[PDB]
Design a protein around this nucleic acid. Structure first.
Ligand SMILES: [Mg+2]
Ligand SMILES: [Mg+2]
Ligand SMILES: [Mg+2]
Ligand SMILES: [Mg+2]
Ligand SMILES: [Mg+2]
Ligand SMILES: [Mg+2]
Ligand SMILES: [Mg+2]
Ligand SMILES: [Mg+2]
Ligand SMILES: [Mg+2]
Ligand SMILES: [Mg+2]
Ligand SMILES: [Mg+2]
Lengths: 228, 259, 148
RNA sequence: GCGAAUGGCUCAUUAAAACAGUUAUAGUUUAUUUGAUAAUUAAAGAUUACAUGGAUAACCGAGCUAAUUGUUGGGCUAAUACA
RNA sequence: UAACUGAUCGGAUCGAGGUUUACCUCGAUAAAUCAUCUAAGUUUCUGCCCUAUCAGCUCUCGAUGGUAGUGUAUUGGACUACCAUGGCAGUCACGGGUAACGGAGAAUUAGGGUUCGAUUCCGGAGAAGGAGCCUGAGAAACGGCUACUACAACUACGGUUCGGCAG
């Protein structure tokens, strides 16, 4: 059996082989999204805790969660399902899926390290994956950068991350994100102008109403004075 | 039929456009707008066929997408190739300062009436509905799909307002009664112009009115196709030159070729 | 000699050109090459040669006449902005339109059948002559121009 | 987002059916168009308005199938997206 | 004027040109209501070829009408419950046939007729056969999905197909 092991902090991913029927007896008849002791697997796994996050059939079929059965079942997948992609708006498909329950028919299991024990596997500890794509939204910057709410927009401006890199051509370049949500003069102007539109609405209407009214009384004065 | 139709075939495009039978398969389907599809003269025809300012399709696009804002309808810019310029509209081309009014001649094809600057401010409007609106505000509605608020209360339904397009202020109006001047928007009597003799209301369905012209030939048409041209014998518009009098082909041939 | 009667003249500010119907009389000669008709027309109307586009000529049966059309743009700026691309090739300004369809449809094939990264890698290889490159050659030719 | 409901093809069904010309909708629906409206942002709760909140794709990384415009886990950040 | 719902709307969005920049002038777009365009659903009246080796037809769950409902975008036996016994027919009902889609039209034509219209335009219908859906403003879509009947393509046999020339 093959185990795709991912762990969240480092962003570690390695995948491992076990041919022992005895070693793999553990995951059998365990539903997905379950906690596993790493000890009963191997020695390098002493003290480890895994979450069974999914897996794949011999035939490639991924496990849907909540489908509770061991082996494949055919479903009608509407939009917003795992195992599925909508080609069109209303879209449904008969799809073959793998159940939640782990059998021997599974070539692959996806494992989430929850608690790592004393035992040290290389790619979990060794690696630190970098930070690419810093925060974009104004408030997200302020937060993740530790800035006050009362603070000036220019402090947000000055604290956005820079990216620096070397072009495959060998050139030297630097790229910056744009801040969305940012409070700029333009936003405030647009706001002022909209409120203007409103106030103009009821003003103009009022002035019309009164113009009509006075014209009216004049016109009825003439209309009744035409009668005698 | 699975919903809306987006195309128009040349054979089916109205005779009033005078398109070539052989010119293609399709013609331009008029856009949803102020005027109906059959009462539309679209912009693309206005430019390509009539003014010849556009020689082909690409050209029309050029004119209407050029940042320079070339064409105007009732004072407001239009960039839409299929915009339904309808009856009584004033279309103005900024580069030449040409100001035309959209009309039917006696033969029922579409014509551009050249207007001087004083004419081009004014446009004639015909009352469709009259109601009390929300907040108890009286309102009025027009053939070109205007909604006018606080109308002069004397204005009845099916009148003709003379509308200042600079001021968006109705100036003078006149209603449908014996003795006023009409133009006829739709009919076999399309394009003819005349003094209303009287009106008969049949009250189940369709009210018919009768007409005379300067020469004294009577007409009749349903009320819906009458458009009022002003008070008296005088029209508030410069008419394409027939003056609104139909000519017998005998009259036509005589005057034209001297028989 | 070539005589040119100039016939129907519409002044078109919208596209800022003059539109023209032409009548060429070549009583002893074959139909006139456009180079000559251009040059004679420019001689008449005093404008530049490359400011005038000449198109759609019909020699009649028996060969005394041809009827054609002409365009005269106010500045070659406009002319360079209005005439479509196949014409700028007739005037040698632009280039060849290379074979589009086959390529484009096989690209459509592969594109539909994969996702983003690979798709971009295919788009890098597209055989098109870009709108960018068009406006670039246009501008450059407008920069190599000399007024008469 | 929008479109994919047009277009193109065919005449198998179909004899008051469909269709045609005439009507009704005061018995209805209509995305895109044109014109006109809009003072109060229910209550509880919440309440920054110099402007609120949490996600995800592309991307990076690890996979499964003999097989497809199949998709599974993991690490990122936007929106006129979702609140 | 009562209340009721909160499942309606009441802009946390974008450009551009700038008077030198804290303020102007043009626009893009989202969306509610009412008109308006566009198109549709239903709908009034009248009009089809051959046949009596079709004279009665329709009504056990709707046939004609009446009531309350229900459902729908709306009207309606469209559907349900109760009630009444109607509705159509020699002025041809009902039922067969059509190598029948209907028109605009076409070939012939002294006049009157005869015979065609699958096929440019407008309607209608269908996407191998049936049914059923999703999503939309609009669909029973078919160059969308689900199933069956009958078939088409891969397969390492376990699976799969952006499988549907009346484009
Ligand atoms: Mg359009
Ligand atoms: Mg009525
Ligand atoms: Mg080209
Ligand atoms: Mg029958
Ligand atoms: Mg009927
Ligand atoms: Mg993730
Ligand atoms: Mg600025
Ligand atoms: Mg027939
Ligand atoms: Mg058809
Ligand atoms: Mg119909
Ligand atoms: Mg074929």
């Amino acid at each position: 059996m093959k185990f795709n092991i991912s762990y969240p902090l480092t962003g570690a991913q390695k995948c491992i082989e076990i041919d022992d029927d005895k070693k793999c007896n553990i995951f059998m008849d365990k539903k997905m999204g379950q906690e596993v002791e790493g000890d009963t697997l191997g020695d390098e796994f002493k003290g480890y805790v895994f979450k069974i996050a999914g897996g794949n059939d011999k035939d490639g079929f991924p496990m849907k969660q909540g489908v509770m059965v061991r082996g494949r079942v055919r479903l009608l997948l509407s939009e917003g399902h795992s195992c599925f992609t909508s080609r069109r708006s209303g879209f449904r498909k008969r799809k073959s899926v793998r159940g939640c329950i782990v059998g021997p028919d599974m070539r692959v299991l996806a494992l989430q390290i929850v608690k790592k024990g004393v035992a040290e596997i290389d790619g979990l500890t060794t690696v630190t994956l970098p930070r690419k794509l810093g925060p974009k939204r104004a408030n997200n910057i302020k937060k993740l950068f530790g800035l006050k709410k009362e603070d000036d927009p220019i402090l947000i401006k000055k604290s956005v991350i820079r990216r620096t890199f070397k072009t495959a051509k060998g050139k030297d370049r630097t790229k910056c994100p744009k801040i969305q949500r940012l409070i700029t003069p333009e936003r405030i102007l647009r706001k002022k102008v909209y409120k203007a539109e409103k106030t103009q609405r009821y003003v103009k209407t009022n002035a019309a109403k009164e113009e009509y009214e006075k014209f009216l009384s004049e016109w009825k004065k003439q209309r009744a004075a035409k009668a005698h | 039929a699975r919903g809306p139709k987006k195309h128009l075939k040349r054979i089916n495009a109205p005779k009033s456009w005078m398109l070539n039978k052989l010119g293609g398969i399709w013609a331009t389907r008029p856009s949803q707008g102020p005027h109906k599809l059959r009462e539309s003269l679209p912009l693309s025809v206005l430019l390509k066929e009539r003014l010849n300012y556009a020689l082909n399709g690409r050209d029309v696009t050029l004119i209407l997408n050029d940042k320079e804002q070339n064409v105007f309808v009732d004072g407001k810019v239009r960039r839409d190739k299929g915009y339904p310029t309808g009856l009584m509209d004033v279309v103005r081309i900024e580069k030449t300062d040409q100001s035309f009014r959209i009309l039917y001649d006696t033969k029922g094809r579409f014509v551009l009436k050249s207007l001087s600057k004083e004419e081009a401010k004014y446009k004639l409007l015909k009352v469709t509905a009259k109601a009390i609106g929300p907040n108890q505000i009286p309102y009025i509605v027009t053939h070109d799909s205007r909604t006018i608020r606080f109308p002069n209360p004397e204005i009845k339904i099916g009148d003709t307002l003379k509308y200042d397009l600079v001021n968006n202020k109705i100036e003078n109006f006149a209603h449908l009664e014996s003795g006023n001047v009409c133009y006829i928007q739709q009919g076999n009597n399309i394009g003819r112009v005349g003094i209303i003799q009287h009106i008969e209301k049949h009250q189940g369905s369709f009210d018919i009115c009768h007409v005379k012209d300067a020469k004294g030939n009577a007409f009749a048409t349903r009320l819906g196709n009458i458009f009022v041209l002003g008070q008296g014998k005088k029209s508030w518009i410069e008419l394409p030159s027939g003056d609104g009098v139909r000519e017998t082909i005998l009259e036509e041939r005589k005057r034209k070729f001297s028989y | 000699t070539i005589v040119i009667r100039t016939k129907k003249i519409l002044v078109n500010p919208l596209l800022s050109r003059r539109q023209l119907s032409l009548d060429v009389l070549h009583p002893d000669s074959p139909t006139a090459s456009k180079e000559k008709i251009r040059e004679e027309l420019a001689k008449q109307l005093k404008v530049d040669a490359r400011n005038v586009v000449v198109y759609g000529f019909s020699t009649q049966y028996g060969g005394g006449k041809s009827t054609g059309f002409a365009l005269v743009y106010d500045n070659q700026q406009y002319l360079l902005k209005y005439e479509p691309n196949y014409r700028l090739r007739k005037v040698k300004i632009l280039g060849e339109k290379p074979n589009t369809r086959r390529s484009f449809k096989e690209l459509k094939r592969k594109i539909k059948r994969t996702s983003g990264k690979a798709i971009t890698k295919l788009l890098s290889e597209k055989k098109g002559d870009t709108w960018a490159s068009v406006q670039s050659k246009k501008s450059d030719h407008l920069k190599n121009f000399v007024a008469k």
